[PDB]
Amino acid sequence: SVLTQPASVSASPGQSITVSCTGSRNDVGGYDFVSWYQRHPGGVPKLIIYEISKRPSGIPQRFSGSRSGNTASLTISGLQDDDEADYYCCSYASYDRLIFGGGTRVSVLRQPKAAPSVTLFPPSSEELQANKATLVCLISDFYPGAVTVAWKADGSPVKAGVETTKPSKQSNNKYAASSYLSLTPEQWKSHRSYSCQVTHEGSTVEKTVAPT
Amino acid sequence: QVQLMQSGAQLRDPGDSLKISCKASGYNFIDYHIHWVRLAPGRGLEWMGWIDPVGGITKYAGQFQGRLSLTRDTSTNTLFLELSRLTAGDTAVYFCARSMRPVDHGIDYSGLFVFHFWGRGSDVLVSSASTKGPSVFPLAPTAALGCLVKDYFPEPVTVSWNSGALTSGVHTFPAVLQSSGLYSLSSVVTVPSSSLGTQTYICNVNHKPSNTKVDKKVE
């Protein structure tokens, strides 16, 4: 099971954000054993909150935790640069299990928001002649560094064959990422279009290519 | 003073076992349950299981039942993880972490359910490569055109354009790791259109591990 968290949230220094963590009566709702973990890019997770609202040693009270029904929430006030991280909720689950949320990127904005440039390439004729096919979705110049990518074949979602990179800081402090959809040529030619959908700060950019 | 010292990163074949260790210090070893947790791409943190150092009793998460074995050596304060029959889905950073508080059996288990002190992590990649040169494909087209540098191992690859003459508007993206355990990257140049057809564009790909140097014209 995966407790449900938003993919990302952002705000400016000195402001407050809240991250939700939605579970069930057999975990978040059923026991008072909800904890939160902070993880910096390339870093080690660190405990921020336990038993829903308690803070361990070293955590200031501007970090706070609550619960309503099956949803736990972490609030961070007075946002500082060090607060930019992935946050994970975690709950005991019946019986004798622990389950994590999928994580939320909290960004502390230090330059204006910038939407991603998206470029989608269809498979090349040379690749098809090698009996293979790859769609390439390139994502650049976005800020802050959090995106999600979804793929559509015609009007439908496609989950198989998708590999997506983490965002990488560019020279200009904006970010780049990319997503690859691997297909058989038969699969490629059997649809009328494929779409790459990039979501950033609540808005989705879509690019489409067609086999013909 | 609580410290968990993990063994390092590893590269493993599909079907191999993964064995990692975690040496504990700065506390009474037998008093604390130890957890293992991993951070896997496209997934958040994933709890794998805990072990009680007293009698070696464990609890495993459902998805690792039948493929995970947690053990302990009390005389060396060391914890071991063995994960069987690796697949690409097992590429992840593996952590050991200490429970918050000792268990009071039959009375209080609350401390079992919190990860307080963490190992530094063991970054694991599951791939059966083997040095392998890339296949380079043109990405046909201000306009954007590129080269796809597909299926190589290991890193890195370098890409230049027009024998080094073209640098403006060039964006070479970080590589993705495919479930095949092979890397792919793309390099894209944004050129003034009207210079299209007027100008030839060639990407020059270098993969030193396999000694491959490819030029690819992008029509």
Residue numbers in the entry:
A (entry chain L): 2 to 9, 11 to 27, 27A, 27B, 27C, 28 to 95, 95A, 96 to 106, ...
B (entry chain H): 1 to 52, 52A, 53 to 82, 82A, 82B, 82C, 83 to 100, 100A, ...
Question: What does the paper behind this entry write?
Answer:
Two moderately broad and potent, clonally related monoclonal antibodies isolated from a single donor, 3BC176 and 3BC315, recognize a glycan-independent epitope that was proposed to be located in the vicinity of the V3 loop and CD4-induced (CD4i) site5. Structural analyses of the 3BC315 and 3BC176 fragment antigen binding (Fab) by X-ray crystallography, and in complexes with BG505 SOSIP.664 by single-particle cryo-electron microscopy (cryo-EM), reveal that the 3BC315 and 3BC176 epitopes are very similar and situated at the interface between two gp41 subunits.
The complementarity-determining regions (CDRs) of the two Fabs are in very similar conformations with Cα root mean squared deviation of 0.58 Å for the variable regions, suggesting that the two Fabs likely interact with Env in a similar manner. The 3BC176 Fab structure was docked into the 3BC315 complex structure via superimposition to explain differences in some of their neutralization specificities. We mapped the residues that are different in the CDR loops between the two antibodies that could potentially make direct contacts within our Rosetta model. Although interaction with these residues does not seem to be the primary determinant for neutralization, residue 53 in the HC is an asparagine in 3BC315, while it is a valine in 3BC176, indicating that sequence variability of gp41 residues in with region may affect antibody potency. Substitutions at positions W623 and E648 in HR2 of JR-FL resulted in >40-fold increase in IC50 of 3BC176, and another point substitution N656A resulted in a 13-fold IC50 increase. With JR-FL, 3BC176 also destabilized the trimer rapidly, inducing complete dissociation within three hours.
